[PDB]
Design a protein around this ligand. Sequence first.
Ligand SMILES: [Cl-]
Ligand SMILES: [Cl-]
Ligand SMILES: [Cl-]
Ligand SMILES: [Cl-]
Ligand SMILES: [Cl-]
Ligand SMILES: [Cl-]
Ligand SMILES: [K+]
Ligand SMILES: [K+]
Ligand SMILES: [K+]
Ligand SMILES: [K+]
Ligand SMILES: [Mg+2]
Ligand SMILES: [Mg+2]
Ligand SMILES: [Mg+2]
Ligand code: NA
Ligand code: NA
Lengths: 227, 227
Amino acid sequence: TSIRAVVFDAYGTLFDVYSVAARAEQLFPGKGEALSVLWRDRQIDYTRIRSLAGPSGEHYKPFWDVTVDALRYACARLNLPLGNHAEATLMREYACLSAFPENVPVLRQLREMGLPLGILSNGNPQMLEIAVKSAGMSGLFDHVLSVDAVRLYKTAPAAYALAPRAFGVPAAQILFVSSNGWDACGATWHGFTTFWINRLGHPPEALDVAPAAAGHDMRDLLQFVQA
Amino acid sequence: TSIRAVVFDAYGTLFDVYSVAARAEQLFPGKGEALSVLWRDRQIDYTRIRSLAGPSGEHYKPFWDVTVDALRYACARLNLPLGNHAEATLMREYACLSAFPENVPVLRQLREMGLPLGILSNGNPQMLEIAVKSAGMSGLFDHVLSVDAVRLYKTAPAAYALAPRAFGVPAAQILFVSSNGWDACGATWHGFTTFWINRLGHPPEALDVAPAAAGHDMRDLLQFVQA
Ligand SMILES: [Cl-]
Ligand SMILES: [Cl-]
Ligand SMILES: [Cl-]
Ligand SMILES: [Cl-]
Ligand SMILES: [Cl-]
Ligand SMILES: [Cl-]
Ligand SMILES: [K+]
Ligand SMILES: [K+]
Ligand SMILES: [K+]
Ligand SMILES: [K+]
Ligand SMILES: [Mg+2]
Ligand SMILES: [Mg+2]
Ligand SMILES: [Mg+2]
Ligand code: NA
Ligand code: NA
């Protein structure tokens, strides 16, 4: 079926989270890769635990505050000295990230081939908006969407449903792009055409579903559309 | 409020999963602790991804088959030679586990103080039932409950709701016991009195909720009831 719009996940897709791991190392020598791993794990675990526990948003909390919670748990567990300064510093780092250098032109070869572009993110909008301004992609997106509108995190249907609504098109006609295998898979269940930017070369998730195609980077995504 | 029944989580609580990590090492030398960690992570990730994606069971699959999926993904990712024999062997190991030696008497000091006992498990019942027969705890539980009845995994309300239903008592009057911090916390949200068997001495989850009490083992749980 014909793509008529293309929606992106934020972190790891549009925005390289790398710079947080590197700054963790500096505050916590020898413990950066461990913190950053544990922190991402719990950040995601907490969004799922919450949305699963309250399928109508009973336990929702914005992604920012969930990210603080996860960072705090990870430091306590890993026995790291995280008080106000080191916390503020890592969160600042989180607020303002940079793009994968390949992205911004590829977005143009799509904008130019007549394609509306959006972001759909677990990110609360307050953090999603500045995050976008770090990277020079202001203007490229028609819609910048947050699961905060529905108080439910991916893979919840109400989160995926935001993009058909904003674009005025069925899921089947939106190309859904994510770095996270679980999310490409969840989007495929919802009925999008999906592309998985598998940056670390991992296996497909064993979820009995597969995205339409996958590649290694954003420029592989361009390849695929043009075909 | 007065406890009138006590319900247990299965794995890590009643049943020591240890013996699987040890048998992983033997089939996959140098890679047992890595497999076992990645496998537990994805097993749980997959139950949440599924239930979050289909809040009415649209993507349900029994825990057994989810456990095979997770084991398969973990082996592919970790580049381990898992064909039919090594898979069958690890799954066998999974079917039939042993208790924490402290458990079976502690269950008796509770049965004897006039307390009905149950299991509530992500475990499909087919695997939950034999699992119980490995360990000598047949007879101690009035109800052996599986989220398979509702096609939704914890922390889904419909999963927690199984125990009030079976016991004929409100959540507030059941003591809910788990090893998994996320689950003690989810149960507390549902309204149980909860106890967390924190076996590895981890911090509390940063979920803005805490179980009624926590301890290190089952005998700490006994301590707490008797008080
Ligand atoms: Cl992170
Ligand atoms: Cl977790
Ligand atoms: Cl809902
Ligand atoms: Cl395991
Ligand atoms: Cl995951
Ligand atoms: Cl439901
Ligand atoms: K509702
Ligand atoms: K900065
Ligand atoms: K329904
Ligand atoms: K055996
Ligand atoms: Mg995880
Ligand atoms: Mg600590
Ligand atoms: Mg491989
Ligand atoms: Na939709
Ligand atoms: Na209930």
